[PDB]
Structures are given as C-alpha cells and as structure tokens.
Symmetry: C3
Subunit: 53 residues, 3 copies
C-alpha cells in the first residue's frame, strides 16, 4: 500500500522524463525556426525558460 | 518514510512547474510563427489545448 | 493522510495529462512548420522523441 504509492510516483517520474524529452526537442525546433531573429527568447522579448529536473 | 514520499511529490510538483514554463513559452513562440495564419489552433484546424495547474 | 498523498498523486496525474495535450499540439504545429524540410526530426538531424504515458 505504501509500496503502491511509491510505484505510482516512479511511473509518474518516468512519464515526466519522457514528456520532457519531447518538450526539449520542440525547443530545439523553435531555436532553429528563430535562428535569423536572434533566437526564440529574443524574438518573444522574454527571459528564456529552462528546464531543471 | 511517509515524509519521504511527500518530499518526492513536492520535488515532482516543482519539476512539472518548471517544465510547464518551458512548454508555455514554446506555445507563445508558435503563436508568433503562426500569426499571419490565424494562430496555431486555426492553422491545425484543432480546438486549442490549454494548461490547467 | 495516506489518502491525502494519494489525492495529490491523482491531481498531479491530471495535470501531466493536461500539459501533455499542450505539448503534443505544439509538436503537431512544428510538424506542419517543418513539412517542406522533411519534418521536425529530419530538420534537427535527431531521432524523434515520442511521448509514452
Ligand atoms: Cl512544447
């Protein structure tokens, strides 16, 4: 029962790891589409958001 | 031990918050790339997906 | 108390589901922006990342 809660958290951690690989690959695609404009953040006029695990 | 499970859930919540900042900044980049076409959802011919915390 | 930890994990699972809908719609937008170049992965020269729930 406490083991079942721990297994759900491990599954959920593997899911977030998978999803973050999709997100960061999307970010690299946007960095390439915005190469001539100074990059994604410079074009939005925003501070860049980075992912911390 | 129950405290260790609670700490893992708090770490995991801080991670998802960080990742969602990257995702929403990517969405704003796509909204700008698709400005002339009526926006990302109008160009996909989809209902827009929004993030609910 | 164990029920409160389980409720937090269910809320967190609903959040990740919501966020993944935003991420995959962003991926479909990038697939369309990169249609002429062979697709997002072919343009990055990367193996494609996919999301596994
Ligand atoms: Cl994304």
């Amino acid at each position: 029962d406490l083991r079942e809660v721990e297994k759900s958290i491990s599954n959920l951690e593997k899911s977030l790891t998978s999803l973050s690989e999709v997100v960061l690959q999307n970010r690299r695609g946007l960095d390439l589409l915005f190469l001539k404009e100074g990059g994604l953040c410079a074009a939005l006029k925003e501070e860049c958001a980075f992912y911390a695990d």
